[PDB]
Amino acid sequence: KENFEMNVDECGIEQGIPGLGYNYEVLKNAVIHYVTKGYGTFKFNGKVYNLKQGDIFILLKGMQVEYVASIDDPWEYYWIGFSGSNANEYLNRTSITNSCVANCEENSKIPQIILNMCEISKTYNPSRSDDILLLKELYSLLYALIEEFPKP
Amino acid sequence: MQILWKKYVKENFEMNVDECGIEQGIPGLGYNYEVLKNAVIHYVTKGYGTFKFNGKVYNLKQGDIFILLKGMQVEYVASIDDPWEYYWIGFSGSNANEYLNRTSITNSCVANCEENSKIPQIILNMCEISKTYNPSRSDDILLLKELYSLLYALIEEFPKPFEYK
Ligand SMILES: OC[C@H]1O[C@@H](O[C@H]2[C@H](O)[C@@H](O)[C@H](O)O[C@@H]2CO)[C@H](O)[C@@H](O)[C@H]1O
Structure with missing residues (x-):
């Protein structure tokens, strides 16, 4: 119901x-965002990123952030x-938590996993074990972040 | 008789x-x-054996699954x-023990996989990953992903009526 x-x-x-x-200032543990369409700006630690389709940005507890949709x-x-x-341990194995912004490459697994998790959550039915499926997908997502954005 | 036997740490509750x-x-x-371990799912890939539990006998073959749960008095033997x-x-x-309550497989503890079953591919993949287990390449994340996939496939292919509480 709430897993640790x-x-x-x-x-x-x-x-x-x-x-x-x-x-x-971010309150939540971690929030990953995938931009599907249009343009916006993410500002963190004196840096500005103009983001578009294919881009990811991650919010972590304690980050002072600004993000705004383009006009x-x-x-x-x-x-x-x-x-x-487990989630916070796996986030330390990816380089994405350095700048907290990345671009998904053409053959990325990340977009389909994020879109699938949001699709499942639209008709979330725990009696049909949608809870098992979301955790499966979260493990897939954290594995794909590590594989595509490794710590070198 | 063990080609593979990779024992992991009880890292996670x-x-x-x-x-x-x-x-x-x-x-x-x-x-x-008498089974000491929490749960052990077996998938028969070839040949024949017999599983005996609670006065019942099952002659198993390729495609069959049997599950061991803590406290079961069992015998399973390869055919001659x-x-x-x-x-x-x-x-x-x-989580694992809650999900096992959503499948009918824990009634007899034996089942037959259907032609289009997802269960064999997941079990074979988990044993393949275990052969070269490398946690520095995040094989730990991959095995947990697969275990969630396995428990989902057991529930989908061997459903029990269940209302979430
Ligand atoms: O765990 C599945 C594994 O069981 C082996 O049998 C062991 C068992 O694991 C252990 O907990 C118990 O104390 O003794 C058993 C041997 O008598 C089987 O050898 C192996 O084929 C698997 O089925």
Whole structure:
């Protein structure tokens, strides 16, 4: 119901409103975002990233962040909030938590896993074991982040 | 008779891969004991053997699964003529034991995999990963992913009526 080792906290899909975003200190453990369409800007630690389709950004507890949809073509993004002792150990095996921004390559497994987790969560039915399927997918996602963004 | 027997640490309390192995049976030889481990699923890949539990006898062949649960008094023995080969996954955890309550397989502890079953590929993949187990390449994440896949496939292919509480 709430797992300690590996937990899918929340899944969502946001359509940005032109020029609108968020500016706050992250409370949640970890939230990975995948940009499916349009444009927005992520600002962290004095750096600015103009993101587009194929881009990922990750929020971690304690980060002071600003992210805003572009005026002209405001982004759509899929997001997975997750927690757990296993999850935080696996996040330390990827380089993505250095800048907290990355570009998915053409043959990336990451987009299909994030889209599949958000699809499952739309009709979430634990009596049909959708809970097993979301945890399966979270383990797949963390493996794919490590494989595609290794710590060298 | 063990081609493979990889024992893992009880690292996790929610879901843990305890061990993976491959046994080629010796004609007429087997085991007779009270299960100590949480749960062990066996998939028969070739040949024939017999599983005996609670006064029932099952002659198993390729495609068959049998599951051992803590406290079961069991005997399983390779046939004389064409002794079985079987792959096995030992696993534990609070999530694992909750998911086992959603499948009908724990009634007789024996089942037959259908033609289009996902179970054989997952078990064979987990035993293959265990052969060159490398946690620095995150083989630990891969085995847990596969164990979640395995428990999902058991529930999908051997459903029990279940209302989530
Ligand atoms: O665990 C599956 C594995 O069991 C072996 O038998 C062992 C068992 O693992 C152990 O807990 C118990 O104490 O003794 C048994 C041997 O008597 C089987 O040898 C192997 O083929 C698998 O089925």
